[PDB]
Amino acid sequence: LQSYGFQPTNGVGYQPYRVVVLSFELLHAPATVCGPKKSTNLVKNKCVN
Amino acid sequence: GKIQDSLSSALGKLQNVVNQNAQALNTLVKQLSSNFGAISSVLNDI
């Protein structure tokens, strides 16, 4: 396990980059995370999707 | 007067045809939740 050497006086491509990897999965959980969605006042008494 | 007591207190042949039909209709719907070798049972998930 070798350490990195990160000085600002080093060319790009040899500079520190912060990496965030997002991974999703969807099988059968009936109520989990959803985006900024809406639909104020649910439409009742109408065949709806 | 005794028919009325013996019944008021036997219709198995009529009950059985009702039961058989309901048991078959339930088995038909309970099959809508098998994979048969797929990733799920829902088309909105495939």
From Swiss-Prot, chain A:
Changing residue 28 to P: Increased resistance to human covalescent sera neutralization. Attaches the virion to the cell membrane by interacting with host receptor, initiating the infection. The major receptor is host ACE2. When S2/S2' has been cleaved, binding to the receptor triggers direct fusion at the cell membrane. When S2/S2' has not been cleaved, binding to the receptor results in internalization of the virus by endocytosis using host TFRC and GRM2 and leading to fusion of the virion membrane with the host endosomal membrane. Alternatively, may use NRP1/NRP2 and integrin as entry receptors. The lineage of its organism: Viruses, Riboviria, Orthornavirae, Pisuviricota, Pisoniviricetes. This is Spike protein S1. The gene is S. Residues 28-49 are annotated as: Disordered. The chain holds residues 492 to 540 of 1273 of the full protein. It comes from Severe acute respiratory syndrome coronavirus 2. Binds to host ACE2. RBD also interacts with the N-linked glycan on 'Asn-90' of ACE2. Cleavage of S generates a polybasic C-terminal sequence on S1 that binds to host Neuropilin-1 (NRP1) and Neuropilin-2 (NRP2) receptors. Interacts with host integrin alpha-5/beta-1 (ITGA5:ITGB1) and with ACE2 in complex with integrin alpha-5/beta-1 (ITGA5:ITGB1). May interact via cytoplasmic c-terminus with M protein. May interact (via N-terminus) with host bilirubin and biliverdin, thereby preventing antibody binding to the SARS-CoV-2 spike NTD via an allosteric mechanism.
